[PDB]
Nucleic acid binder design. Sequence first.
DNA 1: CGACGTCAGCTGAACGGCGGTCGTCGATCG
DNA 2: CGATCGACGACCGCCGTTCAGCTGACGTCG
Lengths: 122, 122, 125, 122
Amino acid sequence: DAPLGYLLYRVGAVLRPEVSAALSPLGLTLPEFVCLRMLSQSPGLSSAELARHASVTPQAMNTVLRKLEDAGAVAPATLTARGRALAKRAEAVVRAADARVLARLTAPQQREFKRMLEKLGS
Amino acid sequence: DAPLGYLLYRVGAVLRPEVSAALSPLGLTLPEFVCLRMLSQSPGLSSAELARHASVTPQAMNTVLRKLEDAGAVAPATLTARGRALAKRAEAVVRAADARVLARLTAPQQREFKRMLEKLGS
Amino acid sequence: DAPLGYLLYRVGAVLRPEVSAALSPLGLTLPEFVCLRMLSQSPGLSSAELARHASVTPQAMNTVLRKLEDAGAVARPLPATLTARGRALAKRAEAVVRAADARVLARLTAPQQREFKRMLEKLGS
Amino acid sequence: DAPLGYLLYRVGAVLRPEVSAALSPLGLTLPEFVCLRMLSQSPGLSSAELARHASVTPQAMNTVLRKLEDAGAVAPATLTARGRALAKRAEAVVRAADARVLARLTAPQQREFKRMLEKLGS
DNA sequence: CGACGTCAGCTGAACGGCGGTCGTCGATCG
DNA sequence: CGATCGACGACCGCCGTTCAGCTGACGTCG
């Protein structure tokens, strides 16, 4: 059939607009959410390793970090209460987008599929 | 767990170096192979629609197209015999890379998983 | 220098927008004025021969003629002819076209103008 | 007397058949000579600006240009060795027609008259 | 002398192509 | 690790090109 990369690509092409439209009314972009979640799971890290874990340039991560400081999400930076709440609601919303693309599969199919994706990386 | 985009991303991050290392000793990059396969499936296409289908800018596609002209792969462009043979061998090697990443799954698991991706992609 | 046709052309290209912009606030185009003046000089002419004298097709001339009937300038019932309003319109049209003429010819002195017009009228004849 | 436009018209109506009969045994029409002379004075010009300077539509100018290509007159087109000579002889015959209409004026009258036309033309 | 069939020739719209413009990413030193 | 310099690459205006749609001009006619 079609190359594996093509299929991953098409699933990504379905997923990313949904995640974008979902994050949009929260005042968040996709990279900003990435940063949110990284700092929410690993508090305290500096900007450089943030950029290293998200495969972006330090300047992009600093732009994001300033947008999040100005928004009162972050204060060797770390998260604040507003940042935690924002992270929660963002997480929930992207999970909703996830459910909405994964809905073409039955629930068992979903579980097994996530196991398989989990395995193919690792 | 982890967001769907993260998992898709990690699988892509496993696959892309593999397809790169696979295409490398054929003198092909990944976009050049994309162009190859596109023209191999739909001969005659012009530069604009070539670029439209691969989600790239027309100038990138023109760079790729002239690089393929210089190699005697392409002649409203279309493929040559050398281009067809090259396309076949390329197909084969990226499919080998695919097999090599998909190998962590059993064969039935592989088939089922690819069915699942094919469905999840609209 | 440049061919005579080029020069005649450039003078025409200066003149025609002037006569057009001049005829415009009277509700007249250039062919309509041509027809007006023809009928003002030779009343009674038919649609066909009107078109023959202006080097245009009969259907175009009938278009202008229908416009001039609707405006109360001409009465056709082949042999068309002018009305009072049509003659007055023809008069002021004449005057305005003469004003455009004066405005392009003004780059020349008056004797130069007279002599030049003699010269053009001879080259045709 | 008669409106100025009538006079320009009558002189044009005398001149144009003469120029046509003059250009005819050279295998040239009037627009072809126009294009020829334009390229003879300004080599290199493209078809669009050629048509734009001659007050014609681009398709007419392209018709003329392909006719002059077939005759080995033109090659952003430009003139050829045959085209330059053809342009010279064309210039000459059109100049002869000019002389034939202008002959109704004395030579000083001719010179002064051409001074007057050039002045009246913006 | 009008009228109609036939069709070449002109105008408005979308496509492909290309410059000026600037944001953004590697490569250095501090 | 943060900063700057140098330059490749992506948006985006205008220009040339094309085709659809149609009003105009010849070549028959009663």
